[PDB]
Paper text:
The potential sulfatase activity of recombinant S1_19B was screened against κ-neocarrabiose (κ-NC2), κ-NC4, ι-neocarrabiose (ι-NC2) and ι-NC4 by thin layer chromatography (TLC), revealing activity on κ-NC2 and κ-NC4; however, S1_19B did not appear to have any activity on ι-NC2 or ι-NC4. Though S1_19B was inactive on ι-NC4, the structure of this enzyme in complex with ι-NC4 revealed the ability of the enzyme to bind this oligosaccharide, and accommodation of the 2-sulfate on the non-reducing end residue in the −1 subsite. However, the presence of this sulfate group appears to cause a shift in the placement of the oligosaccharide in the active site, resulting in the disengagement of the 4-sulfate on the residue in the 0 subsite from the catalytic machinery and formation of an inactive complex. Additional interactions between ι-NC4 and the enzyme suggest the possibility of +1 and +2 subsites. Overall, the data support assignment of S1_19B as an exo-G4S κ-carrageenan sulfatase that is specific for the non-reducing end of κ-carrageenan oligosaccharides.
Numbering used by the authors:
A (entry chain B), B (entry chain A): 27 to 473
Write the structure that this text describes.
């Protein structure tokens, strides 16, 4: 029987900022129970440390740099020299999505919340294998309704923040957006309970702006400023996820539903007070704190409850995992991900990925087993043993010069399989990305 | 009195491949006498190790990466994702050229031979401060006439190879192109002998294809294959330069004429059998063999004959040097070059450039005094003391880790002042550039 698939994909959450990730300060009871119901990945990665490229990898099961989706698509932030600007930046139309693949297997498909895979009509979710959409095309938006005046006074890219149903039916949220998105996903489950369905629940929680339900803020009297907002926004993310998980149980769909929880990129600790403990770094850098994310898979009667899987896995793996579960027999020859199920169930004791890569311009990483080489524009390449140094504080480059040379050559061989980028950020953002990395160069710790 | 200015700019010549550069195999009598007539620079550099970007720096007196002219403009070789392709790649129109500056000082201005600063009409020499043109818009062409049929049946970029007078008056060369270009420059001197003139004589010699006057091939009976052609093509370059130098002497203009000889980039030893002795590397890499070039300045009664100048200088310096000689008092505030005359004459004993930079994508160089840091995509950054190690064979990076870190930060600070590139080569050419560098990693030696 073809299982339902629910992918809950948070935005800008701290690695440490869930109960199941070791938080005692924040409250995530619903997602903690999801963790206990299935397998928790201790080394789950996104394909990039920023939103657009991460989502391009997730949606395609491919290294997004292979189709030139290398730097983040941010209308108004792009170089005057960029090949594509504004609404023309998007997931190339020749790429086949997770939605397209599950549509081939007869699934009902919906996306709720953040898209960020292009603002033009041709890049719209309903053109990319999704039946149904309630969300926003761009990278961020308010958790409450925009006034008519705010929409009138927005710059030429502001339209991508407007809450939208399907193909251009604009209507602002009537309550806290996190609750709207969760309730919509639960309504869609109810409407499609008799047929295989795929939901992509792309919460904007816990992305800026720092806005919360006042009742949620009240539950954190001992937290201050940004961290109090993050706590409240996290409680909202967890409650809204709860609407979906509870609806599945209520309708008896638990045994025949795959639920995934992950996060688009590492926490931007300076922006939303996210905490990536015990990792160094943040959003937009390639330290573990930027690329390693909370990662759960639940499939009752198929995946052992309360289990952990400790070899590296990728958001790139989700497309082939979902497609195989959906009884798909025509996977494209170009997929970088692997079906995780044989690995999760111990049929395959090998690493799903011996070698993994990250790249934004001159900043790149090659990982070989637990060896991690990090290349930078502004400092010598660093080598970490992640099996003894999760926080990347002990540079072993000088002690292992032959391994550094061999990993450098392997990194460049992979770079040679990539397209040149399709769009380029203004020069100044490389300084912002590196300066924040140096601000969070030390390990984060649970408060 | 405003001096005449003649800039002879060869293409793809080997560093060692002139008598005045230490060759005992090749014949360059005319240019050897030019060297003896003036100052020879032992550390003269182009702004890039390839044609288009080198010429953009030369024409502007600016780091060409500041206006996004970073990778070479080669129609048909560009990424399908490139922002600008074919005829649209060119020196940005908001840049002010060497021609424009000397036109302001009342000079007659001419360019003969290779342009390579854009194929579209708007990038044409007669739009960029040149009165007159006989040459070709693109990067290479035959040293003999193309048939009407060859020109009709060429790909969509082939038109940029056609020999052109002024604004689209096409006529193929009636003899060996090197002789045509020299004789045209000599005719222009004759026509303008009573008025200040500037000639940019951009020979395609000694660029591929390997075609020579049979009478020149006859002067090298003991050489074979590519090296014989290079020898013959070099003798032609020297004779054609001779037409110009002999015309200046014949008309008594020697004492009031600045003559410069240089070369667009290091020798592509695999392509035209050029020899960069005693340097390592070649065209398209940032070893000394790619970026250091033969560099002569003659101004009889102003520059001491038979002298050498040993501090680093740049083609970027030629615009301000020329403009100051032309009595210009309104240099732009954006010029990276300096007027060399005070340095040559000992009015300024300081280094003209304490710091110099090169950049193509991930490949970059910072030089601080005689320290050279080289960054690569596929290997650890290398550090050379050029005052003890001209051939870049003793990597000091491990011995001097703090200097490596300091120069890395300074390199990135300069990168932050640049635009993103305006066009991007196909990915595969980075493999070709690096593999050839490794083929010529050892010092070249005089045959
Ligand atoms: O006048 S404005 O007050 O500032 O009006 C406000 C709203 O506009 C703003 O909206 C947010 C906040 O500031 C600007 C915009 O932020 C930018 O949003 C981008 C969305 O794509 C992007 O965020 S991201 O998607 O999460 O990556 C930008 O962040 C990136 O910038 C670089 C590229 O990658 C990283 C950086 O290197 C990434 O940084 S990060 O990792 O830290 O996130 C982010 O800066 C502003 O938008 S604007 O269009 O520029 O004006 C306006 O819409 C609203 O109506 O009013 C408010 C004021 O009340
Ligand atoms: O069958 S052919 O021999 O190909 O036909 C010939 C003519 O077409 C060719 O002409 C030459 C030979 O092959 C192509 C062309 O070479 C390319 O010319 C470019 C000019 O811009 C460029 O040279 S460059 O300007 O000096 O840089 C290309 O070299 C570069 O390529 C990459 C970019 O930088 C470097 C590389 O990474 C640089 O390499 S290098 O440093 O070694 O110089 C060079 O490959 C081909 O032209 S075509 O546009 O591809 O078709 C044809 O017109 C004529 O009619 O027939 C001849 C054969 O008789
Ligand atoms: Ca995000
Ligand atoms: Ca050249
Ligand atoms: Cl984001
Ligand atoms: Cl060239």
């Amino acid at each position: 029987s073809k299982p339902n698939i629910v992918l809950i994909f948070a935005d800008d959450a701290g690695f440490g900022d869930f109960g199941f990730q070791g938080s005692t300060q924040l409250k995530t009871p619903n997602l903690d129970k999801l963790a206990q119901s299935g397998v928790r990945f201790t080394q789950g990665y996104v394909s990039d440390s920023t939103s657009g490229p991460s989502r391009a990898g997730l949606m395609t099961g491919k290294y997004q740099q292979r189709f030139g989706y290398e730097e983040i698509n941010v209308p108004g932030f792009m170089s005057g020299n960029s090949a594509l600007k504004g609404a023309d930046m998007g997931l190339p139309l020749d790429q086949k999505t997770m939605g397209d693949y599950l549509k081939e297997q007869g699934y009902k498909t919906a996306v709720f919340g953040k898209w960020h895979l292009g603002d033009a009509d041709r890049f719209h979710p309903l053109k990319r294998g999704f039946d149904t959409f309630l969300g926003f095309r761009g990278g961020d938006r308010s958790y409450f309704n925009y006034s008519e005046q705010e929409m009138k006074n927005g710059n030429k890219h502001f339209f991508d923040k407007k809450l939208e149903r399907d193909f251009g039916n604009y209507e602002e949220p009537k309550e806290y957006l996190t609750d709207v998105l969760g309730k919509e996903a639960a309504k869609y489950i109810e409407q499609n309970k008799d047929e295989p369905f795929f939901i992509y629940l792309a919460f904007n929680a816990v992305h800026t702006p720092l806005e919360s339900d006042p009742k949620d803020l009240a539950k954190f009297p001992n937290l201050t400023g940004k961290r109090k907002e993050l706590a409240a926004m996290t409680l909202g993310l967890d409650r809204a996820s709860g609407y979906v998980l509870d609806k599945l149980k209520e309708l008896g769909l638990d045994d025949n539903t795959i639920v995934v929880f992950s996060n688009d990129n590492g926490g931007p600790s300076d922006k939303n007070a996210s905490n990536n403990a015990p990792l160094a770094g943040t959003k937009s850098n390639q330290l573990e704190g930027g690329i390693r994310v909370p990662f759960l898979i639940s499939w009752p009667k198929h995946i052992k409850p309360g289990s952990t899987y400790d070899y590296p896995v990728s958001t790139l793996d989700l497309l082939p995992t979902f497609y195989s579960a959906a009884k798909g027999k025509a996977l494209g020859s170009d997929i970088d991900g692997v079906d995780l199920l044989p690995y999760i169930q111990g049929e395959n004791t090998a690493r799903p990925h011996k070698v993994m890569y990250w790249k934004k311009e001159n900043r790149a990483v090659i990982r070989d087993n637990d060896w991690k080489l990090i290349r930078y524009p502004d400092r010598p390449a660093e080598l970490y043993d992640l099996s003894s140094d999760i926080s990347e504080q002990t540079d072993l480059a000088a002690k292992n010069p032959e391994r550094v040379k061999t990993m450098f050559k392997s990194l460049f061989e992979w770079e040679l399989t990539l397209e040149r980028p399709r769009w380029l950020l203004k020069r100044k953002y490389e300084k912002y990305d590196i300066d924040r990395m140096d601000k969070y160069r030390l390990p984060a710790t649970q408060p």
